Design a protein around this nucleic acid. Sequence first.
RNA 1: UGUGGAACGGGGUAUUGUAAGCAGUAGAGUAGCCUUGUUGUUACGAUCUGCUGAGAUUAAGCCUUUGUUCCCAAGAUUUGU
RNA 2: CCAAGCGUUCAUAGCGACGUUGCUUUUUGAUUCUUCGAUGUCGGCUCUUCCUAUCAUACCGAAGCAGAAUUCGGUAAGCGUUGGAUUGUUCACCCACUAAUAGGGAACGUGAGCUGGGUUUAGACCGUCGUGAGACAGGUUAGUUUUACCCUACUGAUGAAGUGUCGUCGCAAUGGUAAUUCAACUUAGUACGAGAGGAACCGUUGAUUCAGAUCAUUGGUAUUUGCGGCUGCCUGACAAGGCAAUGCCGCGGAGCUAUCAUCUGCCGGAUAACGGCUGAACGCCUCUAAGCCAGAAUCCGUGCCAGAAAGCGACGAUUUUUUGG
RNA 3: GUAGCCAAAUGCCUCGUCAUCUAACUAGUGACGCGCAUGAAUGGAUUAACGAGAUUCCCACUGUCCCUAUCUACUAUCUAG
RNA 4: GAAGUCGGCAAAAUGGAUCCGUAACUUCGGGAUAAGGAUUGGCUCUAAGGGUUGGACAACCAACUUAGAACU
RNA 5: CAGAUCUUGGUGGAAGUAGCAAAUAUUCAAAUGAGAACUUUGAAGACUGAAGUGGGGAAAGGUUCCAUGUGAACAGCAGUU
Lengths: 384, 63, 134
Amino acid sequence: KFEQPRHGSLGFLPRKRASRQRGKVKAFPKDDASKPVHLTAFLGYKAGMTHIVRDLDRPGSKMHKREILEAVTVIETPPMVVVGVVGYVETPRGLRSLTTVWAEHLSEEVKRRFYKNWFKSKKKAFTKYAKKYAESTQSINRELERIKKYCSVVRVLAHTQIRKTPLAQKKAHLMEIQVNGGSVADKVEWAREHFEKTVDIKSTFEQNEMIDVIGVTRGKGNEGTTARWGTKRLPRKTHRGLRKVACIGAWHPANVQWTVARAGNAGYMHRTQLNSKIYRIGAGDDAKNASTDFDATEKRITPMGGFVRYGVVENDFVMLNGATPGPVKRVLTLRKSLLTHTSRKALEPVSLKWIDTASKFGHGRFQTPAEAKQFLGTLKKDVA
Amino acid sequence: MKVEVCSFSGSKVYPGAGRLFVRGDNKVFRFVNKKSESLFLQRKNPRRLSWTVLYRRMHKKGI
Amino acid sequence: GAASGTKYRMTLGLPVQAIMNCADNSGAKNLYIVSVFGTGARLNRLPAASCGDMVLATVKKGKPDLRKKIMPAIVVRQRKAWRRKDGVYLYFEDNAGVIVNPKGEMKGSAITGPVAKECADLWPRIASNAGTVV
RNA sequence: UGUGGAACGGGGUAUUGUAAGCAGUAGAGUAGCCUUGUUGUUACGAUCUGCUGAGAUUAAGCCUUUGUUCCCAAGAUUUGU
RNA sequence: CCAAGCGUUCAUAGCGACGUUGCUUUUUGAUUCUUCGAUGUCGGCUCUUCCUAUCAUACCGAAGCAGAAUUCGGUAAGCGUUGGAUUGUUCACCCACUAAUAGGGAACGUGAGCUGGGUUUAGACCGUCGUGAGACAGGUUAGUUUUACCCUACUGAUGAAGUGUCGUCGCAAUGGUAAUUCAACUUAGUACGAGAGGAACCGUUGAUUCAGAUCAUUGGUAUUUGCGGCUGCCUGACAAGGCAAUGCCGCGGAGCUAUCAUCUGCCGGAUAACGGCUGAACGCCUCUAAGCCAGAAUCCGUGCCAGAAAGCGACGAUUUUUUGG
RNA sequence: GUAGCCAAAUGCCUCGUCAUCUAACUAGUGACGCGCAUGAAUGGAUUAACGAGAUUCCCACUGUCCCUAUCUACUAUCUAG
RNA sequence: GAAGUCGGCAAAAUGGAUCCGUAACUUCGGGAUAAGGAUUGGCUCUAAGGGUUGGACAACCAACUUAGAACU
RNA sequence: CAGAUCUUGGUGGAAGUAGCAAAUAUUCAAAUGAGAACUUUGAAGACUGAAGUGGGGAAAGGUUCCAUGUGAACAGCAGUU
Ligand SMILES: [Mg+2]
Ligand SMILES: [Mg+2]
Ligand SMILES: [Mg+2]
Ligand SMILES: [Mg+2]
Ligand SMILES: [Mg+2]
Ligand SMILES: [Mg+2]
Ligand SMILES: [Mg+2]
Ligand SMILES: [Mg+2]
Ligand SMILES: [Mg+2]
Ligand SMILES: [Mg+2]
Ligand SMILES: [Mg+2]
Ligand SMILES: [Mg+2]
Ligand SMILES: [Mg+2]
Ligand SMILES: [Mg+2]
Ligand SMILES: [Mg+2]
Ligand SMILES: [Mg+2]
Ligand SMILES: [Mg+2]
Ligand SMILES: [Mg+2]
Ligand SMILES: [Mg+2]
C-alpha cells in the first residue's frame, strides 16, 4: 500500500566488479556487403570534459536559432595500428575463431601486452612467428586463404599508440575490430594491406555521427543500500543505523530474495552508453584545434594548465556531447551505432561557436596565455 | 556569443561562468564566481578590495 | 496547461507549504502554496513549483475577503537559482507570485518587481502587466 | 641500463588578497623644546599610503621540464607438451 | 440458470421478483487437532515479490451524426497507482493534484529491522459497582523494547589444479534485463454536422515517473588547517608561533556529490481478444473443417549485465650452451 | 440532587450539536445539557503565582522532512602480542 | 521551512552587559529578563567624582570609576 | 546406565573468533641489557590548571613504606620494571 517503483534496475546484475578494464564490444553492427570495407570501432583515452556554445538548429523549438551551452567529453584518439586478422566461422554453437594471422613486425608497445614484466623478460614473443614470415611467405598466404574460404566474420587486430599520449603506461591496448563491408575476400585483402599500418579516427567516424561509448565506470568501493540502490534513509531514531533497508524479506520464502537491495560493490562496472554525438573530430597536426568560424583565436584543445590529471592533448581527438563512463585517462571503446537515426535531433548538423579552454583546476577566467597577459598588464615577475 | 563583465570584480564573464542575480529594484548583477557573489552580499565595496579592477581603475594601479 | 506552449525543466524552489510574496495589487500579500499543477505520483515527494508554474494557494495576510479560500496563482520570481538553456544560472531576491484564474488571467492589474522570462512567455496576461522582464 | 626511475629545483595552472621590512607627516590628536615657520624640529599615536596582483600555498589523485643530484643491470618461490 | 416483468413500441440495449445452482469471506463464531521446561502482540515507517476480481496506460466489440458518455465492457497484471488535514489506528470521510489515485496475498509479509502512538494489568485520578479488600460492555496520566561473534540464505571479495605452463585475444550455454506516462502545437476550425460546434492516425516541441552514468558549468562540503581575519592566554616586545579535545569567522582549489548539476535510454518474431481470405459440411449461406493473413503495453528473442570458478576456441613463448627440457 | 460545574482526567450512545480556527481536523477552545453514571471538607466552584506534570495552537528556528550530500575523531578492517 | 512524526523527538535559534520599552491578569506582593527595540572593538582625547601634603589657595605622591567626543 | 535442565571431574566445536577503541600525546638521543614502544638520564612536545592528575588527614587496609636483588607466576600487549 502506497506503491512505488522498485529501486534500481534488475538488468544490471550482479553489481560485481567488471572482469575487465578495457571495454568490450558485446555486439558489432550488422554487416552490409554492399558498402565499402570499413572499421566498426575505435579505442581512445578520456582526456577530460569541457563545454561549448553552439547555435541550435531545431525548427519548432523555443531555442531554435538561439545559443545553447553544452558539456562535452574530449577523448584522445591517436591512430591505431593494424597488426593482425582473425577469421570466425559460423557454427551451430556460435561463431568460432578459425585462425589468426599476424603482421611480420610488431612494435614494442603492443608486445608489452603479452607480458607482466616486459623489461625482465627475454622479449621472445613473436620471434619465431616473425621468422616464419620471412622464410617462404607461404604459410601466411595459406592462413589468409582459409579465412577467405571459411570465416563469414573477419576482425582486424588493432592496438593503440599509447606512447603518443601523456600516460605513464607503456603497454598498449589491443582489440579485435570487426571489418564490415563488401565480401569476405575484400575484408581479408583490406586487412592484409593494413598490416603495420595506421588507421586514424577520421577514417572510422565522421562529424555529426551518432556512436556508442563502452567503458568500465569509476570505482566506488563498497556502498550501503542508501547510495548503492537509492533506498530511503531510515529515521533519525533508528537504533543500529539508518543507511539500510528495514525489511529484507518476508517469512516464506525463508530466504533472502535476489531482488532485495544489499550493501556491496557500487562501481567499476561495464557499461555501453548509446547515442553520443560527435561534435568535432579534431586533428592533432593543426594549431586551431579549438577554433571556430566565430572564434578565430588560434587555440588547441587543452585547457590552461593542461587537462587535470591527464596533460596536453597533442593527437587527434573526438568531442562527444555529454558524459561517458569512466574516469580521466581510462581507455574507452567507441563503437558504430547498431540503430538507425532519422530524428531531427540525431540528424542535425553541428557547428560549434565557441569551445571553452579556461583552466579546469579552478575558476579560470582566461582562455589563452595571451588573454591573461593582456588583461593583467605586467607583473613583478614579468618585468624581470 | 557575447562576453559579460562581473558586477563586482570587473573580470570577463565567459558563458557558463558564475551566476546572474536580479535584485528587487530590477537591477541585474552578473558574478563571475561565488567569491564575488558572496562578497557583494556581504555588502563589501569592490572599490575597497585590491584585487578587483574597480579598485585598480580608481587607484590607477599599473599606471 | 495550455498557457502558450511549453516550458523547459527548471530547478524547483517552492515546495508545498512555502509562502511567497504576492507581487500584484489584488490586496493579498502572503501566498501559501497548497498544490502544484502537473504534479504526478512519487511517494513522499513534495509537489514543488518554479517560475511560470501554476499553483494552488491561500492568502494568509491581506484583505479579509481574499483569505480562507484556495485560488490559482502563478510563480513569477524565485530565490533558488535555475539554469537557462544558454547556460546561465539566475535567481531573484525573493519568491513572488500573482493571483490568477484557471485560464491564466490576472486577478490584479499591476505587477511590482521583475518577472521571469519563462513566466512571461507562458502567460501573456502576466507579460502584459509585467514591468521589467528578467 | 631504459625516449628508465626517484628526490629536489624552475615554468605554467590554481587559492587567497597585498607579506616582512623600510619610508612618508597621510593620521583623530596629545605633551615637552626652540632660531617661532601656509613642511617648526621632538616624542607617542588605532590606522593609512608606497615599494606590492604583493607574499604565502600549489599534488598531496594538477600540467610541464633538454635543470640539478642520486639510484637500479638485484635476491627468493613455483612451473614442462 | 429460470423469465413474470421496467424499459411509450422490443420478455434478456441497460434494469430484472419469486426460485434455483455455485465461488469466496480478510466477519465474528464453531471446534479444540499443534504450541503452556515460553513461535515476542496492533499500527506506522521501510523494502521486495506474487495474484487479478482492471482504476489508469495498449489494442479490440455493441448501442445514436459527429463530439463525446456508458458497457473496461474482450484480451491483458508489461508498467503506474501520489501530496496533505484527521483517525494511535484498521477502516473512513475531507482538501488537492493526477493518466489514475484498483483490490488483495506473502505466519491478518515485515520488532536480534526500527518506532512504541495502541495494548502495556506494578504508581496515580475519576465515574459506576462493592460493607470491604477490591471490580470494570469504561475514561485518564506516568511507565527498561536484550543478544548474532554459529549454519544457511543473500550481497559483494579471493581461490587449488589431473586434464602441459604462463599469457594475449575471443566464443556463448545459462541466469538477469527497462523504460513510463502526459501536455501543447501541426494535422484543423478539417472529417462530421441544418446550426452549434467538433475530431482521429501521424508529425513536432517539451514535460512526468523510472533507469544507467558523469562532474565542463552551477550549488553544497572543508584537516588544502591553502590564504586572510578575530578573541583569551603563553613564548620579554616587534616579528614569528603555540594552546583553547578541529578555538571562532570569510573565501577556499582538489575530491566527493545534487531530479540543487549535466548526459544517454531500440526493433524483430510468435500470439490473445478480435477481424478477413480460399473453402465445405447441412448440394445455399457462413472467418474453420485443413490452411493462409492481420492483430495488444501480452509472450519469446536481438540489444544491455553476468559469463559455466568441472562449457569451449584462436594465437604467442616454451627453464639454454650450468641444469632441466 | 439545592448552589454550582460538564461530552470535563467523570457521557455509553459518540466522530453528541452549534460556533470558532484550517484548503481540509474523529484534535483543541467556547457554548449547549433528562448528566449511561456531575455535584458540594466522600468537599463543589473560582483562582494570581509556581510546575523536568497533561493538552491545543502561534512566532522564532531549523536536515524532522522534500532528498540527500560532505567532512573529522574512534571503531569496524589488516598486522604483532 | 514541521510538508516529517503519535507528538518539533533531536537539533537549530536565544543568551553577557548598557540604554529604551514592557500586555492580559492579579491574592496588589507579582506577572517581568513579559513582549519588543538599540548598542558593544581599537585608538586619541574631554568632563565630573576622593585622599596624603607647604608656604582664599597646592607642587607632587597614592587611586580607582562613570559619562561623553573625535578618529579608525 | 544413554538419558533424570541428573552428580562430580575432565574436555570439546563455536576460535586464533568476539574482542583488548572513554579520560587530547607523543617524539629524538644516550645508558643498561641476550632482548627496550613500555626501565633510567638528557632534550623536545603536551596535560592536570589551586572545587588539581598538587600538598595532608579521618574511616578502612596492614607493611603495601625503604634499600638491595629477582624477573617463574601476576601486572588481560610487554618487562631490564
Ligand atoms: Mg531507540
Ligand atoms: Mg576543476
Ligand atoms: Mg511518506
Ligand atoms: Mg538469455
Ligand atoms: Mg600548554
Ligand atoms: Mg469543551
Ligand atoms: Mg455536605
Ligand atoms: Mg566485524
Ligand atoms: Mg520561516
Ligand atoms: Mg503534519
Ligand atoms: Mg504524514
Ligand atoms: Mg528538545
Ligand atoms: Mg553416562
Ligand atoms: Mg533409559
Ligand atoms: Mg546433562
Ligand atoms: Mg579480532
Ligand atoms: Mg582542559
Ligand atoms: Mg592546561
Ligand atoms: Mg602525598
